[PDB]
Amino acid sequence: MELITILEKTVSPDRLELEAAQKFLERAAVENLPTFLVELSRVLANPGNSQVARVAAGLQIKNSLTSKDPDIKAQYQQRWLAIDANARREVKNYVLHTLGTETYRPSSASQCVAGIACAEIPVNQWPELIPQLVANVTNPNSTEHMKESTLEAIGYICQDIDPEQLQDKSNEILTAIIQGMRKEEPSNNVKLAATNALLNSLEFTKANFDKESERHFIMQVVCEATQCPDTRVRVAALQNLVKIMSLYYQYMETYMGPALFAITIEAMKSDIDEVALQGIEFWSNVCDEEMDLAIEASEAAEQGRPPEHTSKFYAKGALQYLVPILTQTLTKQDENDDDDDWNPCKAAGVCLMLLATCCEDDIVPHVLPFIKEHIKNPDWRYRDAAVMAFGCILEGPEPSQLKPLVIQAMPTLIELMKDPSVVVRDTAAWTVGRICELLPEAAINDVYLAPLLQCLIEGLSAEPRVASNVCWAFSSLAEAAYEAADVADDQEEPATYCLSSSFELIVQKLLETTDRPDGHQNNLRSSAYESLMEIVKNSAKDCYPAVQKTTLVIMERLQQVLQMESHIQSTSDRIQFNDLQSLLCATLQNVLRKVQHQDALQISDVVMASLLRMFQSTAGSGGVQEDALMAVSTLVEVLGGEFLKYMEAFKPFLGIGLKNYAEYQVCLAAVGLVGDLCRALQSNIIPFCDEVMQLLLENLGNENVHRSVKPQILSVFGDIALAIGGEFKKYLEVVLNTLQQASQAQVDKSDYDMVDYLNELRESCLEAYTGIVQGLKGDQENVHPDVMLVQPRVEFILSFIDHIAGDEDHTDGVVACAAGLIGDLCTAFGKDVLKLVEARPMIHELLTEGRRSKTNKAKTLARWATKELRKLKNQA
């Protein structure tokens, strides 16, 4: 049977033929893969067959060559490379012959060519392919279908290869693409294909784009496809004009003036969505780049050096043309709309915010007449645009000249938060929240403070799109009032602030807002919970009985949720359930951090029982395990030495938190809990530590866990050394050998993503050495004789700190910890350290570099270390 009829049966709507034909096609692919590929190439290359059979034939080739999973893609390319070169040449010949042999415009042959080339361009087994594609494009003898399919094949290729291989062949495919993108081609499909191809073929064209006469031609040819009547060509040309601005800043001085400005402005004023969107996005990218350049221009000027790259100030020069368009675009809003739908009106606000943070104090005289004339206007789009345009400009300029505007703008916004239209109410709530966030003392001012609280408490009950915006305003207002009172109230904690007369009922309305049935819309439940955490954390000493009430209510809810787990049936049930448990655990943490100890003793047993039950019954899912461990850590920290009554029931869960190394965040939380646990319990951690050290050494032994877990284990070894003291000698030799092996490791300098890890591990090793020295030293007025078990290692430690002292690139925590270790070694032993420290000068360099640094703990620890060293040296 011919395979053409099998493909035609596979397209057919009846599954009784479809499943049998599909299984025959699969058995043909299994029985002999290259013969099946050869026969499908013979089917594809024939102009006489039906187009449906040819496309169905090409589908199998496209599926065989490429896939979305990368390891499957790798072994698919490997199984292509295992076939004999003559049969591969046969299918290469037929697939390359197929281009131009189809009258339809979507074609499978271009993607077949792309998959074939992606499988074997890194091994140079097809040299003819690039000259054939370039020759097909460059030939003046017509055939528009062939030219379109070749340009689409080049564009398909340029997005799938690793760019380091196409850097060899970047001179010829650019010639083909720019030949195809020129203005004299009559077919607009060819122009569209070449314009979509150049957007991919851009990252590895750096040597072409660096040469002046080539980049002039590329910019001139891209600047012609923005004037095409096809509009898809217009969108595709603006879309890579944006990318050229993003990647090749500091080349754009020649073109930005007498070309790109007019193109982008005229694109902004269009009445088509996808054409105005790119004109907005171009200037948004300009505002990103010109802020990064200013950051580096300040950073290099602090050290007195000129910066690497200077800025050109395009966005500051384009303000008076950009702002009257950006304000006007904000009114283009529909009477019914969706929240997640990106549109030009939604883009103009983000561009205005970025323009505000970039240009700073100069943006306000261009925006302020718009708000002034459209705050009072009987049309909801212009009023909503005025409120949004007022709320965008807050983060930019100087607050000292920005607060008199909002002082007299507050009574308008108080009225405007009770508008007939929902959209104006939502925008008014957002601007009030930004007023609380950025200019906090202008909101605390008691002329408008009580009506503002009345408006927010009323607006907590409204539509779900505006209650969520109200909640963040509450969260900001609590911190503003707490910090304003904390300046006044002396030493510890404020006794009475602005919101203590109204803390009750605010807390009650938040507890009502939590239990809404429509809480799944617009993050309502989670935003109410975050507001509740932020209000409980920043409470005064006056508000404590309300905190008692909230603690009772929260523990009641937490006891309810533990019975709810069996009523779960679907995936969305688990998705909402895990969010509810995470929010309850974080709220319990913020409650436990605030309650007094005499009241914290009373809730502790039911808190640990509920945390233990939610650790047991839940089938992993990661996040609840992390949150349970962190909640237990804060409970340990607040309870102190009284925690040990719960220890023996907690020990197997601590063990299984350490033993399970599949997820690294739960074991990171476990080792942080081990550090907090030993730091709290001090000398009583003796009978539990053997399993802990064995599990930590086993976790050090494995070679496929994540790299970030490894720095923490050495630090908690230092912590358990400090907690134990004299009984650490049975682990001392083992941990010293592991510290030697850890310090003897090194890694390459070429990437900062490895240099940062090297610095982190160095800090961890130094902390472990300080921990073991201070643990063996004892707490008495004279040093214990057990420190002399470390005395062969002092030359090794001094060579290690000499080795890190020899490096030229340091995180400041490295020298800050090293100075403390030098001070510990000065206090640890007698005068014998002097003839070792006199031989290495870079530690004496480091003990001055620590004091001249700006980070304070390095200065203090280096001063203490050099004081001990000078005291030792003067006692000759």
Partner: peptide, 7 residues
């Protein structure tokens, strides 16, 4: 004419 090439 193709006129321009990169090399």
């Amino acid at each position: 004419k193709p006129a321009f090439s990169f090399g």
